[PDB]
């Protein structure tokens, strides 16, 4: 299942070292995790909570925060951000 990220998601992935325009979903998830981790967007106490309100991630998800445990929600964000 190869995917092609829209401009905003692509900007996010490239910001963490991704140098391609076509991805497998696992690669997309890998680099999104790298982005969240490197920018420390997760809550330090309940580390499945991710705050994205004042970050490009917030524009992608269209929400202020989400839980890493909500897999369907995360997949839905990627899918809506694909061409």
């Amino acid at each position: 299942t190869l995917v092609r990220p829209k401009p905003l998601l692509l900007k996010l992935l490239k910001s963490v070292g991704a140098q391609k325009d076509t991805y497998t979903m696992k690669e997309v998830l890998f680099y999104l995790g790298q982005y969240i981790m490197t920018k420390r967007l997760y809550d330090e106490k309940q580390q499945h909570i991710v705050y994205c309100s004042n970050d490009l991630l917030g524009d992608l998800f269209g929400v202020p925060s989400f839980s890493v445990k909500e897999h369907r929600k995360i997949y839905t964000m990627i899918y809506r951000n694909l061409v």
């Binding site: 696992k26 995790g33 981790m37 997760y42 580390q47 890493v68 897999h71």
Partner: peptide
Amino acid sequence: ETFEHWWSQLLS
């Protein structure tokens, strides 16, 4: 659990 722990599950 740590952020990496939760996230790694999405790669499982």
